[PDB]
Paper text:
The ataxia-telangiectasia mutated (ATM) and ATM-Rad3-related (ATR) are apical kinases that orchestrate the multifaceted DNA damage response to a variety of insults and regulate genomic stability. The basal kinase activity of ATR plays critical regulatory roles during normal cell-cycle progression and aberrant activation of ATR signaling pathway can drive cells into senescence. In short, our study reveals a novel gating mechanism by which kinase N-lobe toggles between two alternative docking sites and recurrently commits the Mec1/ATR kinase for substrate recruitment, confined catalysis and product release.
We next determined the structure of Mec1-Ddc2 complex endogenously activated by MMS. Only one state could be stably classified with a resolution of 4.0 Å. The assembly adopts an asymmetric conformation despite having two identical Mec1-Ddc2 heterodimers. The whole molecule is significantly compressed, with the length and height have been reduced to 200 Å and 155 Å, respectively. We refer two monomers as ‘MMS-mono1’ and ‘MMS-mono2’, which demonstrate similar conformational changes at the domain level. After the Pincer and C-lobe are superimposed with each other, the FAT and kinase N-lobe move down by ~10 Å, whereas the Spiral of α-solenoid moves upwards by ~11 Å relative to their positions in the structure with the basal activity. The structures of Ddc2 and Mec1 Spiral domain are well matched, but the conformations of Bridge and FATKIN are significantly different, especially the significant displacement of LBE. FATC rotates 110 degrees downward, coupled with the displacement of PRD Kα10 along with Kα9 and Kα8 downward to the left in the range of 8~12 Å, which more significantly exposes the activation loop to facilitate substrate binding and catalysis. The most significant conformational divergence between the two monomers is at the position of LBE Kα4a and kinase N-lobe. In MMS-mono, the kinase N-lobe packs against the HEAT 25 R/26 R (residues 1005–1090), in close proximity to the Ser1333 residue in human ATR (corresponding to Thr1092 in Mec1).
Numbering used by the authors:
A (entry chain F): 2 to 32, 44 to 474, 480 to 632
B (entry chain D): 189 to 526, 532 to 747
C (entry chain C): 215 to 321
């Protein structure tokens, strides 16, 4: 359909209508409410089935419609109102389009993050009064759903209607199973934080009452199988956002009460078995999410004790556990790892077929799913497998920032891997050749690696500090208080002298014919590179007396002459870094030079980060 | 379309599941189910306790008796009754072995923990009277343990930190306090999700006053507090405020809670927000309380939250003999507890960060509890709030970006949110702010708004070219998170359907932009602009707003 | 049991066995000062959510029976376990006729 171009015309019109002035939000009403019909129609025709179920084109048209309501911010300051709340007559048909998008986790996270913006943010202009009535109507809807969830326990409902009532349950539920970054005080129960919002255990109560309702009322349709396996998916989506997001290690939990709750919940669902469904990696997905959360951390006895599946073990079979094929596969995997570090791991050796440690599996094979892979090319499935299995690496089980310096260009640890010098020389030769005109993505990842690795060659001179142990640096990256630059002591080593990273970086990213301007953001990237390399390493002179600001301080100045915050403030931070020194701050020649520099510019863009740099 | 009655339901006896989740209940790092840790404890300064058939005889493991109680009142009560009855009984036990100053009160911590596992096993039916009972109860217990919550900021000469290096009883006291503060949170939760037709009961001046004394003992502005208790107290404040909003007939109970009493909350809570975080020495006696530490000397998780390493949970895996009917328990040690994994400090700081999210959001919740207001917000919730907002702008800039650590994005999201708090205060609560305090902090206000303002045009990328380089130099943590959510942590975000990465390239990019001081959502940017360009009040001098804006334009 | 004034599970909780520091049939961790009853409660509890009615019975029968044995064939230790273990076996056995299964009873 060409209604793709119809929505294109409407979004081009709204983009044209910016505001009275060029900058386009206008928090307050401008009674000029001309796109009112199109705005209503956005959701009036969202209840259709032609291209209202498509993504790509139509999806970005809806993303542009969200930007139009932020370009009009709040027209309710003098207009846009209804009998009760108009923001709720929006949310309700948004939840209709949600039950349309009921299953697609994509289509639900995106929609409720933008409506998050709408409620947690785009009414957050005001807060109290609109929020109050919004929460009132939300609680009304919740009570209605709960009262409807009762009479289906006794059979006097429909079949599709029952499916959709329990699905609307799920939709409220997932809408509610994210972390703070998705809502705020808009909804009554997602307002607090630190392991509890007024939701979290209103929600545990929800989950346990609905387990009651499930063991009370059921039906044998595979769609119902799905709208229950999605519920175990959500009862672990409960915890995924309730994690401290530990970089790249499986994210430790904020609250071991989510841990015990979900343990109890999916273990009672091992019991329930309600609605088995074929072709379902969701089951083992949840089990391995949670075990990933429970690998070998202090949560160990927690998981094994409050979710013991082990009592479905039965080594004497090749059809091992009774839930579903690939589930029981990965669950025997998790089981078998449990047994692994239970028994003496000396009884385990790396048998090298799949190179994971294996103890004596059994005299007879009896291990059809001991280590094998199984997926319809499902990278998530096999990566669950691999992380959990190799989690007892007993070798290179560390890193996050250094692991990212390797993630972009995968296949990169095919060698020493631990070794600093391999990435040293590879990024050297990269910036020596690896660009023609467009290497402004991978070269950029090499500059973030150059910064991190400066901070690593700082982590050293203190026995094993290589890429191995690196979630973030110390002298630069453990956040502090006080005068932070107290930490940065001049007795540090000379940059170029004790960093070939500096030598060849000074050659390449600093003696660039286009360092003046090749990619503003890449400029700021190498800027933070210099920031950190200096924070760790003694400063070479900015100016050698006879001019030549050191083709890096030159970047400081020129970006200090930016047009917005970006390159400008990213420059400002490091002036002091050159100042903290000795033998170049000896006669404070550096100090006086940079004092004259902070007084060698008055351009209006830069008064702010000027006052920063001075500070 | 029948949904059939299943004429042979198997529906759990949740009191039985509770009996289980008690007898098995094990704290994080313990050798035993903490119930059994009780179950190996006889005490010789309480010969014989009873409240209602709870004889901890002269020869009883406090466990032996408590588990037996579980059995008795299991036969007696129904679920709500059993919650109430364990509350009353286990409590009056906590007293009689707490106000008895010569006996091994290490039952008490796990007894409180049992309060916790009770109230938060069935917060559905737990009810106001016993709620307040245990609330006020361990409140007076914390007034019992005045010593540890109020230990000199640095042990001024005369006072010496020559303590027996003892998380032994340090655990006893601290554990009780934090566990019971989490129990206060869970009691607030039973009422917090309880119908707001019935909110005139668990609120009373006794709740408030007990919390006065305990809150003031924990947030010890003069002595050296500990961060589990600080967390826990401020969390209690938080949920308190949550219900101060979520109570429908709000004026009456807002009259009940004294204005000076919120004021004595928020003097200490501003004190908190102005206390800071020194990771490198967070596990070391640092400066006078201006360095939230949670020192390894007093270091475990807590209950609805796990902030420390809980290393001393391992020494709870040496808390009792585990092979002996100990009268006094096995050491836990302040010295033994705590170049290894500063991820410890990082996750704990990600907490303290989320703590100050709590603090900002409940300052914000105060902002809502009054639309017409009183002494707690008198322009002071602009002074201190914007002081935090600008302190975090200055810290994120001067160090934290480039410090490029796990904290970045969480902190920047939440301090842009405290910006939004400043916004709604300065728009709706614009009524209160008077000249004296808009002059005390004209500074902070105007220039924090200016800092956020120098961004919108953003001629740098406006796209995913190398602002994704920035997403790598700082947001590398959230890059690990996009990798982890697509490869480990979403059933559907593997094999992306091509309508989502088109969005990712710019969305995660403006995420890292909000990290790196720029490209805050047009929402955010015009919030910050309209806070300042609100010429209705001469926060800016009209003849110099041009010199202001010309850093960007306008 | 008449005169055994206790929750006989607690009775069991008062049964430590130093010599045997290694025990595990269906997850039955036991050590020196580690009470038979501590592992009894261990089982009872998580076995409730794991096992069903009769499979709970059978699991108790066989596990606590392995206990019956390895203490019985352990003449060096004393067997205070087996009397009340067997008393537990009886509460099990009695609990229902129809629920209790003849296979378990056989074993």
């Amino acid at each position: 359909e060409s209604h793709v171009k119809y929505l294109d015309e409407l979004i081009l019109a709204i983009k044209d209508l910016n505001s009275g002035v060029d900058s386009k939000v206008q928090i307050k009403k401008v009674p000029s409410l001309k796109i009112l019909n199109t705005l209503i129609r956005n959701l009036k025709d969202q209840r259709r089935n032609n291209i209202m179920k498509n993504d790509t084109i139509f999806s970005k048209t809806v993303s542009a419609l969200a930007l139009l309501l932020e370009y009009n911010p709040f027209l309710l300051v003098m207009k846009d109102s209804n009998g009760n709340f108009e923001i709720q007559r929006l949310i309700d048909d948004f939840l209709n389009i949600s039950v349309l998008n009921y299953d697609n986790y994509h289509r639900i996270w995106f929609m409720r993050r933008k409506l998050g913006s709408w409620c947690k943010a785009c009414v957050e202009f005001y807060g109290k009064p609109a929020k109050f009535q919004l929460t009132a109507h939300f609680e009304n809807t919740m009570n209605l759903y709960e009262q409807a969830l009762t009479e289906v326990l006794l059979g006097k409902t429909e079949l599709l209607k029952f499916y959709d009532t329990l699905k609307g349950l799920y939709i409220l539920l997932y809408w509610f199973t994210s972390e703070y970054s998705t809502f705020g005080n808009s909804i009554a129960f997602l307002d607090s934080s630190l392991g509890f919002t007024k939701f979290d255990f209103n929600f545990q109560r929800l989950i346990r009452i609905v387990l009651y309702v499930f063991d009370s009322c059921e039906l044998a349709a595979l769609e119902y199988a799905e709208i229950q396996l999605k519920y175990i998916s959500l009862v672990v989506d409960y915890v995924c956002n309730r994690t401290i997001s530990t970089a790249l290690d499986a994210p430790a939990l904020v609250c071991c009460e989510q841990l015990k709750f979900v343990l109890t919940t999916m273990h009672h669902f091992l019991d329930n078995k309600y609605g088995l469904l074929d072709n379902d990696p969701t089951m083992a997905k949840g089990i391995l999410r949670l075990y990933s959360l429970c690998i070998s951390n202090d949560f160990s006895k927690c998981f094994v004790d409050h979710f013991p599946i082990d009592q479905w073990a039965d080594f004497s079979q090749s059809e091992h556990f009774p839930f579903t094929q690939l589930t029981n596969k990965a669950l025997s995997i998790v089981y078998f790892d449990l047994k692994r570090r239970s028994l003496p791991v000396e009884a385990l050796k790396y048998d090298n077929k799949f190179n994971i440690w294996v103890y004596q599996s059994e005299p007879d094979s009896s291990l059809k799913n001991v280590t094998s892979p199984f997926d319809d090319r499902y990278k998530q499935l096999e990566k669950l497998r691999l992380l959990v299995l190799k989690k007892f690496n007993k070798t290179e089980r560390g890193t996050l920032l250094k692991y990212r310096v390797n993630q972009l260009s995968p296949g990169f640890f095919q060698r020493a891997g631990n070794d600093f010098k391999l990435i040293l020389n590879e990024a050297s030769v990269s910036i020596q050749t690896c660009f023609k005109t467009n290497n402004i993505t991978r070269l950029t990842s090499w500059t973030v690696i150059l910064g991190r690795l400066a901070c690593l060659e700082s982590e050293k001179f203190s026995s094993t500090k290589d890429m191995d142990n690196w979630y973030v640096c110390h002298l630069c990256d453990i956040e502090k208080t006080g005068n932070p630059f107290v930490r940065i002591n001049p007795n540090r080593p000379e940059a170029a002298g004790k960093s070939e990273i500096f030598r060849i970086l000074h050659s390449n990213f600093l003696s660039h014919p286009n360092i003046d301007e090749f990619s503003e953001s890449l400029l700021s990237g190498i800027l933070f590179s210099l920031h950190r390399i200096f924070s760790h390493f003694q400063p070479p002179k900015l100016t050698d007396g006879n001019g030549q600001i050191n083709k890096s301080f030159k970047l400081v100045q020129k970006c200090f002459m930016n047009s917005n915050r970006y390159l400008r403030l990213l420059s400002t931070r490091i002036i002091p870094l050159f100042n903290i020194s000795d033998s170049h701050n000896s006669e404070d020649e550096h100090t006086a030079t940079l004092i004259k520099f902070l007084q060698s510019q008055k351009l209006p863009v830069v008064k702010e980060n000027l006052v920063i740099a001075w500070t | 379309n029948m949904v059939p009655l299943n004429p042979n339901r198997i529906i759990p006896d949740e009191t039985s599941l509770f009996l289980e989740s008690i007898l098995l209940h094990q704290i994080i790092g313990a050798d035993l189910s903490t119930i059994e840790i009780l179950n190996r404890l006889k005490l010789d300064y309480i010969t014989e306790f009873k409240f209602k058939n709870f004889v901890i005889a002269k020869g009883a493991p406090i466990g032996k008796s408590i588990v037996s109680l579980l059995l008795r009142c299991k036969k007696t009560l129904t679920l709500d009754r059993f919650i109430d009855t364990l509350l009353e009984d286990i409590a009056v036990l906590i007293k009689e072995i707490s106000v008895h100053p010569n006996e091994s009160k290490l039952a008490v911590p796990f007894l409180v923990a049992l309060m916790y596992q009770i109230v938060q096993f069935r917060p559905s039916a737990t009810h106001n009277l016993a709620l307040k009972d245990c609330f006020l109860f361990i409140c007076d217990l914390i007034r019992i343990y005045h010593h540890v919550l109020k230990v000199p900021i640095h042990e001024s000469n005369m006072n010496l930190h020559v303590e027996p290096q003892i998380f032994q009883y340090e655990l006893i006291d601290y554990l009780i306090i934090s566990y019971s503060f989490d129990l206060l949170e869970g009691i607030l939760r039973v009422l917090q999700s309880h119908p707001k037709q019935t909110y005139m009961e668990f609120f009373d001046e006794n709740i408030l006053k007990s919390f006065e004394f305990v809150y003031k003992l924990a947030l010890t502005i003069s002595y050296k507090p500990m961060v589990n208790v600080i967390f826990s107290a401020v969390e209690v404040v938080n949920i308190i405020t949550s219900i101060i909003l979520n109570m429908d007939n709000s004026s009456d109970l807002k009259s009940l809670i004294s204005g000076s009493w919120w004021r004595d909350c928020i003097t200490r809570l501003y004190a908190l927000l102005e206390k800071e975080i020194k990771s490198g020495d967070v596990y070391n006696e640092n400066v006078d309380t201006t360095t939230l530490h949670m020192s390894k000397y007093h270091d475990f998780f807590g209950l609805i939250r796990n902030i420390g390493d809980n290393e001393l949970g391992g020494l709870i895996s040496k808390l009792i003999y585990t092979d002996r009917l100990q009268s006094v328990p096995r050491v836990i040690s302040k010295e033994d507890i705590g170049f290894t994994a500063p991820i410890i400090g990082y996750k704990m700081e990600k907490w303290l960060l989320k703590l100050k999210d709590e603090v900002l959001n409940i300052f914000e919740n105060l902002l809502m509890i009054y639309g017409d207001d009183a002494t707690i917000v008198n322009g002071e919730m602009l002074i201190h709030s914007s002081k935090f907002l600008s302190r975090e702008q200055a810290l994120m800039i001067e160090r934290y970006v480039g410090q490029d650590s796990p904290n970045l994005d969480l902190r920047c999201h939440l301090i842009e949110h405290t910006l939004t708090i400043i916004y709604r205060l300065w728009k709706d609560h614009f009524k209160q702010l008077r000249e004296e305090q808009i002059k005390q902090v004209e500074s902070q206000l105007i220039m924090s708004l200016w800092r956020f303002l120098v961004c919108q045009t953003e001629t740098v990328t406006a796209n995913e070219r190398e602002m994704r380089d920035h997403r790598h130099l700082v947001d590398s943590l959230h890059d690990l998170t996009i990798k982890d959510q697509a490869s480990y942590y979403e059933d559907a975000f593997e094999d992306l359907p091509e309508y989502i990465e088109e969005e990712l390239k710019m969305q995660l990019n403006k995420r890292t932009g909000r990290i790196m001081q720029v490209k805050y959502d047009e929402k955010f940017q015009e919030m910050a602009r309209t806070i300042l360009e609100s010429k209705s009040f001469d926060l800016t001098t009209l003849e110099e707003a041009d010199s202001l804006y010309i850093s960007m334009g306008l």
